Structure formats: C-alpha cells, structure tokens
Symmetry: C2
Subunit: 212 residues, 2 copies
C-alpha cells in the first residue's frame, strides 16, 4: 500500500503539473478536493493515502494529449518506489469516476474510489461550483447560454467531451445531477445545501435574460 | 442628430468588431444592453439614436490597443457622415461613464449618458453579472478568491485597470455598488431585484470555501 512520503511525492507532482492552469483546476481546487477527500475517507474509514493519492491526480488528466499525460504519470509514479498494485488501484479510481464515463454505463467503484468521486464532485457544485463552471467556460470562449440550444438529454461520452454546449446547459447536463449520485453519505447532506444555490442562479439567470 | 441609417451602420460596426469576443462582451451582451437602453431612454425621454449609438459603441473601444480602436471608430463614424457635434456627443458618453473613471473624481453626464451607463451596469449584476463576471476571469486568467487578499477600498484609475484583483473582490469592489449608483428611476427598481442573487453567491461561495 502507498506510503506517506510517497503521497507527498504525488502531491508535489500533481501541483506543479497544474501551476499556471487558469481553467478552474488549480491549487485551490486541488487542495480543497484533497481536504474533502480527507475528511471523507474517515467518514467511511477508507484507505487515506490511496484516496488522497487518486484525489491529487485525477485531474492531471482529463489535457491536450491525454496519452502524454498517463505515460508521464506512470514515469513519475515509477521513480517513486510505486507498487504496481498501488498503481493499478490509482488508475482504477482515477479512470472510472469522472462523469463523462457514466455515459458508458455506471462502472461500480472502490470505496476510496467512491470517496474521491464524491470529494471531486462536491467542489464542482455549489457557489464554488458555479464559479468554476463559468470561469472554465470563459477560459474557453464557450457560449454561456443560448435560448436556442436546449440541454442535451441522452449524450455519449464522445459528444459530452467533443461537442460544445452552453455553460448554462452544463448545470442541466451534469451539474444538477451530482448531488443525487454522491457516493458517501456525509457528502450527500453536503450536496443538498450545495444544490439550492445553483438553482437560485439558473432560474435567476433565465428570468433576468427573459426580462431583458 | 444621429440618423436611423447611421444608427444601423453603427450597430453593424459594433457587432462586427465584437465577433470572437470570448470575454463576455459579444453580441448577446450588446443586444441586452441595447434593448435595455431603449426601454430606459423612453421612460426618461432621452434622445433615442444618440443613446443606442453610444450604447452600441462603448465596448468597441478589452482592447489590446485602445488608441488603434479609437482611431478606428472615427474612420467609421466619418465614413457615415456622422456630424462633428454628434461625434463629440458619442465620446462624451462612452469615455466618461465607466466606473473605472469615477475614481478620478465625480464626472457629470448627459441624460443619454446616464441611460447608457445604467443600461450597461444593469447587465453586470444579477445572475447574468455573476456569470459574465467570472466568465471574464476565466478568459483573463484572474484569480477567483484569496482570503489573504482583501477587497481594495480607495482604488485609483490605474490600480483598478492595471492591478488585477480577485473575482470575488470585484463584487465588493464594484458590482455590489452599482444599484445604488443607478441613475434612472426605472433602473433603480430593476437593479433592486438583481442584488439579492449576487449576495447569495458571494456568501454561499465563502461559506462553502471555509466549510471545506
């Protein structure tokens, strides 16, 4: 199983890879998902170090050339007395959690995996979720909204990942669902108060838009 | 004054120069402000064509090279035989209605100016303001929040435009004051159902950040 001084090795690796990010997944996001991952691990008594490990890393991926990403991570993983069993587990979590995959059938997950998916999704919803949502869109010149394009119902991972929608529609395509798919239990009660604000913003948004 | 033909031309000019905006100042923004300027102008009995004209042209001049931009809009107004006095009345507004300016001391405005300003700000608050606000931070790479950094209080022309702040600080530093600064009676009213949302956002954002 992973070790404390290896985790920090992973932490160090994850942060640098994400300095100068400017997309909504920088230190603050990493540390917050990390800080949530931590408390969470306990509420379920899951393997911390493996949990926090995947937590810092899930994102370092997602990236212009996804392949380049993995490799380098495997490399770094290696030069750190990483065990191949501690590695696979990592990619098991980090490679079967992100929403996009749910469009390929709900792939059951590890406990500590479920603890990550939760902590990661918790920081994508709420007021902070709203901010990251649009900040990211503005970092991509993505159409914020268009009363002419409805939110896509049944998508495909390819569409979701390649086809462009509207920042507003993102709430309806994924941001509004993460609270009812939250794995933990403590996460759930935390997802509740974090869903009411997103709606206060979307309805408010469309009301205002329609008024104008 | 400004003729219906020149007006349309200016509209055409504006929308072209703001294509590929990706900062929250593209065609929707322009249209929302426009449509707002028109209602407000009428309620106040303001000269319509000067108003929209100045409304259409405020953002055009976000600009890497402002000089270049100014020296472009004239080429256009000139190509449209807009009269001297009319050209003067257009810069009179645009160039002396921004909040950034107000720092250099209180500057009196026209009625058409107060209307353009109220229209422009009216679209920088409410859910839409929230969206556009952070959507801009994504675009520029600005920081979303930093408990260490607190909202400036005695800003100056430069500080505000040169020295970048945090996204949240912008509500405190600017957006939260607009509705009190609104000029039009019709606007003060409208600016009244557009503050509660921004406040719920900055509040829920700091509640969620600390919680973690």
């Amino acid at each position: 199983m992973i070790t404390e001084t290896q985790l920090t090795a992973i932490q160090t690796y994850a942060l640098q890879k994400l300095a100068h990010d400017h997309s909504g997944h920088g230190r603050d996001h990493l540390q917050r998902v990390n800080r949530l991952a931590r408390r969470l691990a306990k509420d379920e008594g899951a393997n911390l170090n493996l949990t926090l490990a995947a937590a810092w890393l899930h994102d370092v991926i997602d990236m212009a050339n996804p392949a380049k990403a993995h490799q380098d991570l495997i490399v770094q993983l290696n030069a750190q007395n990483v065990t191949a069993d501690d590695q696979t587990a990592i990619f098991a979590i980090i490679d079967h959690m992100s929403f996009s995959k749910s469009f390929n059938g709900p792939q059951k997950l590890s406990l500590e995996g479920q603890v990550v998916q939760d902590a990661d999704r918790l920081d994508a919803i709420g007021a902070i979720g709203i901010a990251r949502a649009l900040y990211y869109s503005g970092h991509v010149g993505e159409k914020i909204y268009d009363p002419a394009i409805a939110p896509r119902e049944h998508m495909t991972r390819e569409q979701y990942r390649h086809q462009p929608g509207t920042a507003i529609n993102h709430f309806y395509e994924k941001l509004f669902k993460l609270a009812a798919l939250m794995n933990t239990d403590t996460a759930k009660a935390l997802a509740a108060h974090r869903t009411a604000v997103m709606h206060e913003f979307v309805d408010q948004f469309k009301a205002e838009w329609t008024a104008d």
